Amino acid sequence: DDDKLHSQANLMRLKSDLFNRSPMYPGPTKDDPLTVYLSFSLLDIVKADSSTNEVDLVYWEQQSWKLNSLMWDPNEYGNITDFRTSAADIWTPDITAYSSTRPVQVLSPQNALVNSSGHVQYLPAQRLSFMCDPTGVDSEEGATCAVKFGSWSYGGWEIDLKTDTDQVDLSSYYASSKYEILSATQTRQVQHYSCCPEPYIDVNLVVKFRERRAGNGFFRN
Amino acid sequence: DDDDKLHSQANLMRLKSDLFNRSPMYPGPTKDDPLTVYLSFSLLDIVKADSSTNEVDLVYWEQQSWKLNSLMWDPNEYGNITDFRTSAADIWTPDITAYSSTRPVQVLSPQNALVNSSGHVQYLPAQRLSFMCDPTGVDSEEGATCAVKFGSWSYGGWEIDLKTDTDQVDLSSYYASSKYEILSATQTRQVQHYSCCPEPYIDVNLVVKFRERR
Amino acid sequence: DYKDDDDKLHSQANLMRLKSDLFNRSPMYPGPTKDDPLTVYLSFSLLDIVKADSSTNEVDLVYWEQQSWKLNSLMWDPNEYGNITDFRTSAADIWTPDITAYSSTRPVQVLSPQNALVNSSGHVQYLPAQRLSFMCDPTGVDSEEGATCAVKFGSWSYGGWEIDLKTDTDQVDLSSYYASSKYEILSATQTRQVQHYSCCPEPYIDVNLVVKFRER
Amino acid sequence: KDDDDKLHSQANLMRLKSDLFNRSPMYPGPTKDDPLTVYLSFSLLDIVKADSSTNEVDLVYWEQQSWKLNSLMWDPNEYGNITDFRTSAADIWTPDITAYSSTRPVQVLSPQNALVNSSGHVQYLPAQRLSFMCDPTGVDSEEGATCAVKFGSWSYGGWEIDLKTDTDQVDLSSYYASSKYEILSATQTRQVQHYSCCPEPYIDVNLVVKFRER
Amino acid sequence: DYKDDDDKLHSQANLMRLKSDLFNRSPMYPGPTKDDPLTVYLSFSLLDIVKADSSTNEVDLVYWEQQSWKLNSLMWDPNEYGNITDFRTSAADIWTPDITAYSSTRPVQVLSPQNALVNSSGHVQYLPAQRLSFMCDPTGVDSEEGATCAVKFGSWSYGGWEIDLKTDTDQVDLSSYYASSKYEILSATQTRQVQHYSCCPEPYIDVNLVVKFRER
């Protein structure tokens, strides 16, 4: 049972070495660029407001990246290959929804997973209000909306974005939602501004949805 | 007698300082240092059920308990203190969360925890929760049925194992004049597997059947 | 006069010296224990019943809650500190009890600066003004007999062997109640209660606030 | 060269702030032996909402507060002739003035910073949105509705803090011309309150506003 | 590449070194004075008119507000810092101006991470995205001429001798305005104004944002 206090001490020592004994990573630069992978799972479309043209979505947004400053040798740490930590202990990217109408709300505990090769996985669940015209949601063809995500302060030469797939994950979508999903895609886009040389990257989340019509009966999920 | 109670008070200051200021905070469980967390619910009120958004608002107390070796002490060195209350910010707490909440949880009680000499912690946040629920049927005799799963957000079953003492949600505090009456409320431990990973994942499924008070 | 100015200066330095000896000398009070229990006195003054929602069965109440307790670690000899017999300070500088409404439906909102009064015998007086939403069925509010609701207040984490709760009176103070409120108060009472549970030896104390009210 | 003088005046300001704030313990607040006079004045910006279902009204206003501390004085000659500065309100003591009949926490609409001058005067001007207890009945007639809310210290009696007003007329010059509600009059009046339990008098400023639908 | 990783490490150290020298090596900037006046450039990009409330005469606007200024104490020689000419940093790490909307009815809400760009000549660029409720009478929004509203922005505590405000253009940027908004913009202008008060010698500067809009 002295093995247990031992591995606890190894973890404590690892985090102290990583966090306490080095200054926090200052973020990416044009000389030290970063790639952030984004992926979305849509959970629920909660509300569509046709008087303001705002829609409210609940989703999980997976973010991952890699820092050399987060690497270690599992063998000096008693074979710890990964650990959970508070997101406040690490640098995280400034990714944001460009068309939000209210401050995004965080639904999940804010913690991340770091492994020995320096990879970070951060998966905040969020509630978002964003600009969307729901017109046609009460029909069978439904309504279509889009919101773009990306760094607020960094261009493409500092932070690049990529997605693993263009399919947004619907496997967790709430089956009894007021709204059913017809389709959801997530697409990397490159934009330029005349005033500036560098590219700007965003991931475009496009959702087609309609009012769910129920039969009379219990729909179980 | 009044000079004993000053020692008593100094004994706790000393115990608190020895636990909290001497080693670092517990950095969560690991695969080879896993932790069991007991979870149990007491439902207070169903406040609102919204047909327009399909969200329901529950008020409840969520009882969490676990045990840490680093929180143990010998009461004889501490003036026979067997336990104390402390701010929850002073201790590690599990990341248990409702998977299908639609709004940030609202905290209805001061956040303090009880720690006892064998290192067991008792944490009892009272909360208001909005979660995804379709209230249809709430006006029938059969009523409406909703489910919300709770568990660790970031830790798997090899790190945090999750348990209940009973599969019965505690109704003894449920508000008798609520707009909604409770037909049944259950809390069931479930084990889940993802094809992506060998690790089992644990949740407690809170299932509630309810209808408008008639 | 620079004699008056010096006087002012010396008296400020005295209060500063008192506060520094109390607060910066010994670690903050760790809270009460079985061997060192604390008595907390509660009293309520009702200000407005702002609304009653019959769709959710919630009521919103504005009130002032007076809390007071004594700590030996807050005591001083006024002779050593310029004849200061008391002072006002931020509620953050001192231990406060964990008293909470057991049947709130939303986090309680604090309406007043959070400051407390401390006296040389170690007594603390703290009067937060608050707005609370709590579970109440306001059926009958539209009839002469009115509606009745109750909410219990007490320590969330400390049982009766640690914190003992008491009331000055069993009569809620109505003297500051808003005369133009949508609801008039038929009566309000505040009563200490002691509860025991099969599971546990320790008694649990609360103060039970019962308000009977109807539309103006 | 010119950048040198500017650099010097910055150093001067920083030196003054350090001497005032870092080089001494903050003012403990007023006492019976060291009382403080606080000047209060109101400018009404907008009556936003009048809710007849709850009897609450929502006002946007700025509240001017000023007082003088000997411990904020300095000789401009030792400070590069700085006669005043702007500072964060957290850096200095501010009085506990409060609306006694508020129904929700006041919302702060302006950056919280104060102006301090060499003679020790502080000027602090928070812009606020306030919901308070008011019965709007009559708001739909030509006579209008009347409402009053009292402002004063929460924790200090008249022997510690004394309130004064510059004038009994509330400043309307900034009132929003297109507001849903028109102002017939607004007065701000110092009042002395007595309670049976206590020798100490209690001071407040009573803000009375007559208004009607525009 | 392994030596390529040494170079990245070195560049991280350079930036960390830079920030440490700017921030931890001096007391905070105390803000502007009449002897060290400051010019702030303001520009607006209109995003959405979310809601026009005719029962309260409040309108809710989503916009980006670009603020730019220059501090001598933020300058550095890139040659001493590995040729870094700019960096991003948390807005909390720097002084920021007190610019505020004078006719807001609710606290402004921040929609974007608060970080700023600083470059070697001492220029800062801060671009908060915000949602603002302000006093506006939406009458005529359902007609052809539409409705017209205006809100003034400027320093809350500094006069013209300390903070001067400019705009680069009198034209609000509409290129990002949501095409599907409930409301379409007929025009938006942003104009520097100089306010004078009888009581005071010092002028007070503001930027007046005027928006003419109607139901789509």
Ligand SMILES: *[C@@H]1O[C@H](CO)[C@@H](O[C@@H]2O[C@H](CO)[C@@H](O[C@@H]3O[C@H](CO[C@H]4O[C@H](CO[C@H]5O[C@H](CO)[C@@H](O)[C@H](O)[C@@H]5O)[C@@H](O)[C@H](O[C@H]5O[C@H](CO)[C@@H](O)[C@H](O)[C@@H]5O)[C@@H]4O)[C@@H](O)[C@H](O[C@H]4O[C@H](CO)[C@@H](O)[C@H](O)[C@@H]4O)[C@@H]3O)[C@H](O)[C@H]2NC(C)=O)[C@H](O)[C@H]1NC(C)=O
């Ligand atoms: C610190 O950072 C700074 C800023 O990042 C950096 O300075 C810049 O460095 C880069 C890399 O050197 C420069 O970008 C390059 O530009 C090259 C083209 O410019 C050359 O040709 C220009 C045009 O000449 C014609 O036109 C003019 C009229 O316009 C006319 O008078 C001429 O006669 C001629 O007809 C010319 O203006 C320019 O001359 C300037 O710069 C040189 C050297 O810097 C200097 O000697 C001169 O006196 C004068 O100041 C120059 O001759 C371009 O070819 C090159 O692109 C190649 O490499 C890139 C990758 O680097 C590839 O993408 C591409 O495929 C090519 O292979 C590159 O884009 C930039 O112009 C520098 N200067 C400034 C101010 O931005 C420093 O180097 C950094 N310091 C350190 C220590 O790292």
Ligand SMILES: *[C@@H]1O[C@H](CO)[C@@H](O[C@@H]2O[C@H](CO)[C@@H](O[C@@H]3O[C@H](CO[C@H]4O[C@H](CO)[C@@H](O)[C@H](O[C@H]5O[C@H](CO)[C@@H](O)[C@H](O)[C@@H]5O)[C@@H]4O)[C@@H](O)[C@H](O[C@H]4O[C@H](CO)[C@@H](O)[C@H](O)[C@@H]4O)[C@@H]3O)[C@H](O)[C@H]2NC(C)=O)[C@H](O)[C@H]1NC(C)=O
């Ligand atoms: C700091 O602040 C707190 C309050 O915020 C102050 O607390 C007070 O402390 C004093 C001193 O301990 C208390 O006085 C004592 O009271 C007890 C109990 O009797 C009181 O309450 C009883 C029921 O609640 C009741 O029997 C009594 O009623 C009668 O008596 C009072 C007059 O005292 C009268 O007003 C009533 O009409 C009744 O006739 C009474 O309410 C009492 O037993 C103590 O008595 C003895 O000791 C005193 C000297 O202390 C002596 O003079 C007597 O002869 C006797 O020997 C004592 O009177 C008071 O109750 C506390 N009030 C509280 C807690 O709110 C505290 O004093 C402040 N400190 C300082 C330094 O200012």
Ligand SMILES: CCN1C[C@]2(COC(=O)c3ccccc3N3C(=O)C[C@H](C)C3=O)CC[C@H](OC)[C@@]34[C@@H]5C[C@H]6[C@H](OC)[C@@H]5[C@](O)(C[C@@H]6OC)[C@@](O)([C@@H](OC)[C@H]23)[C@@H]14
């Ligand atoms: C700092 C704020 N920032 C937010 C921006 C905002 O981007 C977007 O909203 C956006 C991006 C790609 C495609 C469409 C976008 N978009 C819109 O343009 C409106 C709508 C809400 C939306 O989704 C992110 C990228 C870049 O900053 C890294 C910006 C660009 C960099 C450059 C560009 O100026 C033309 C542009 C900025 O204007 C400011 C900068 O000037 C220094 C910026 O505010 C955003 O412009 C859209 C754009 C800059």
Ligand SMILES: CCN1C[C@]2(COC(=O)c3ccccc3N3C(=O)C[C@H](C)C3=O)CC[C@H](OC)[C@@]34[C@@H]5C[C@H]6[C@H](OC)[C@@H]5[C@](O)(C[C@@H]6OC)[C@@](O)([C@@H](OC)[C@H]23)[C@@H]14
């Ligand atoms: C990090 C966030 N986290 C939240 C999750 C969320 O879990 C659930 O929502 C859930 C769990 C059991 C049963 C039903 C669940 N569920 C749903 O799946 C939708 C509905 C709202 C709901 O309640 C907790 C457990 C685990 O993390 C410890 C997750 C799984 C671990 C693994 C799994 O990937 C296949 C899965 C994650 O996708 C991410 C991970 O990849 C590293 C995760 O986001 C959640 O997936 C549902 C699931 C992970």
Ligand SMILES: CCN1C[C@]2(COC(=O)c3ccccc3N3C(=O)C[C@H](C)C3=O)CC[C@H](OC)[C@@]34[C@@H]5C[C@H]6[C@H](OC)[C@@H]5[C@](O)(C[C@@H]6OC)[C@@](O)([C@@H](OC)[C@H]23)[C@@H]14
């Ligand atoms: C820590 C949370 N705490 C809140 C409680 C809550 O108290 C009440 O809600 C309550 C008390 C007396 C009478 C009625 C009460 N009540 C209700 O039960 C419903 C309604 C909201 C209400 O007012 C305060 C006192 C004590 O904690 C010091 C509790 C008791 C201690 C003991 C008791 O268990 C039987 C009881 C607790 O259940 C938990 C404990 O077991 C771990 C507790 O959650 C509360 O029980 C009501 C009760 C505990």
Ligand SMILES: CCN1C[C@]2(COC(=O)c3ccccc3N3C(=O)C[C@H](C)C3=O)CC[C@H](OC)[C@@]34[C@@H]5C[C@H]6[C@H](OC)[C@@H]5[C@](O)(C[C@@H]6OC)[C@@](O)([C@@H](OC)[C@H]23)[C@@H]14
């Ligand atoms: C500490 C909180 N405090 C708020 C009070 C509240 O003041 C008012 O509400 C008020 C003041 C003057 C005129 C009318 C007032 N008033 C009302 O009383 C109802 C309505 C909301 C309103 O505006 C401020 C002044 C004094 O505090 C320095 C109080 C008085 C000091 C003394 C008085 O006891 C009778 C009175 C207090 O009751 C408590 C105290 O006991 C130590 C107090 O809570 C307030 O009483 C209204 C009154 C005390």
Ligand SMILES: CCN1C[C@]2(COC(=O)c3ccccc3N3C(=O)C[C@H](C)C3=O)CC[C@H](OC)[C@@]34[C@@H]5C[C@H]6[C@H](OC)[C@@H]5[C@](O)(C[C@@H]6OC)[C@@](O)([C@@H](OC)[C@H]23)[C@@H]14
């Ligand atoms: C400190 C608070 N402050 C906010 C003010 C508020 O500014 C405005 O509201 C404003 C400014 C320019 C033009 C129109 C303005 N305005 C209005 O006045 C009403 C309407 C809402 C609006 O936008 C900012 C500028 C200056 O402070 C730097 C003020 C002026 C400086 C001077 C002026 O006194 C006459 C005036 C102040 O009254 C207080 C001061 O006394 C020291 C002030 O509160 C604001 O007056 C509008 C005005 C001062």
Ligand SMILES: *[C@@H]1O[C@H](CO)[C@@H](O[C@@H]2O[C@H](CO)[C@@H](O)[C@H](O)[C@H]2NC(C)=O)[C@H](O)[C@H]1NC(C)=O
């Ligand atoms: C510390 O806490 C645990 C529970 O959190 C206590 O364990 C209990 O032991 C008592 C023996 O009287 C039993 O009532 C329970 O069955 C045990 N708990 C559980 C969950 O089964 C332990 O005794 C506590 N130590 C004390 C009280 O000092």
Ligand SMILES: *[C@@H]1O[C@H](CO)[C@@H](O[C@@H]2O[C@H](CO)[C@@H](O)[C@H](O)[C@H]2NC(C)=O)[C@H](O)[C@H]1NC(C)=O
């Ligand atoms: C730092 O940023 C400033 C702008 O904030 C840049 O200065 C601008 O340069 C452009 C192009 O020459 C000119 O229009 C003006 O001289 C500047 N604009 C403003 C607002 O002053 C500058 O390029 C940057 N400095 C360095 C050296 O990188």
Ligand SMILES: *[C@@H]1O[C@H](CO)[C@@H](O)[C@H](O)[C@H]1NC(C)=O
């Ligand atoms: C860490 O995570 C990355 C991303 O999934 C993975 O490719 C890598 O193999 C992991 N490293 C270790 C040692 O676990």
Ligand SMILES: *[C@@H]1O[C@H](CO)[C@@H](O)[C@H](O)[C@H]1NC(C)=O
């Ligand atoms: C305190 O009071 C005593 C009288 O009891 C007096 O002699 C003394 O001067 C006072 N102390 C101060 C500092 O005023």
Ligand SMILES: *[C@@H]1O[C@H](CO)[C@@H](O)[C@H](O)[C@H]1NC(C)=O
């Ligand atoms: C400081 O403020 C007061 C008014 O509050 C004014 O009378 C005075 O002139 C100012 N400065 C001084 C006294 O030098």
